[PDB]
Structure 1
Amino acid sequence: QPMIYICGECHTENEIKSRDPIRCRECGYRIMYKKRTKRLVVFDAR
């Protein structure tokens, strides 16, 4: 539901809902990266 994103420029975690323009509440920068997931990752060292 929250789906916190990351600004490309100022690296600020900012709340965005669904069906909103991709905007950062500061710096007006328009490219967002999502996050790292919460589910478990298991890597063999091979």
Structure 2
Amino acid sequence: QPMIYICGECHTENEIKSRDPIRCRECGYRIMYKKRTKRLVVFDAR
């Protein structure tokens, strides 16, 4: 129900909800990647 971002360097969940400048909670590293989606995808094995 919230959005959860993975930190770039230290691999922690950060949960950026407030309108903040982007910042890791534990480190000072300033790059976030989204998590992988929960829905399923179908690939052909070709």
For Structure 1 versus Structure 2, the TM-score category normalised by the shorter chain is 0.7 to 0.9
Question: How many angstroms apart in 2 are the aligned matches of 1:34 and 1:18?
Answer: 16
Question: How many angstroms apart in 1 are the aligned matches of 2:13 and 2:38?
Answer: 16
CA RMSD of aligned residues (A): 1.3
Moved over 3 A (4+): none
- Structure 2, unaligned runs of 5 or more: none
- Structure 1, unaligned runs of 5 or more: none
- Give the share of equivalent positions with the same residue, in percent: 100
Corresponding residue SS for 2:23:
coil
The total of aligned residue pairs comes to: 46
- State the TM-score, normalized to the length of structure 2: 0.84
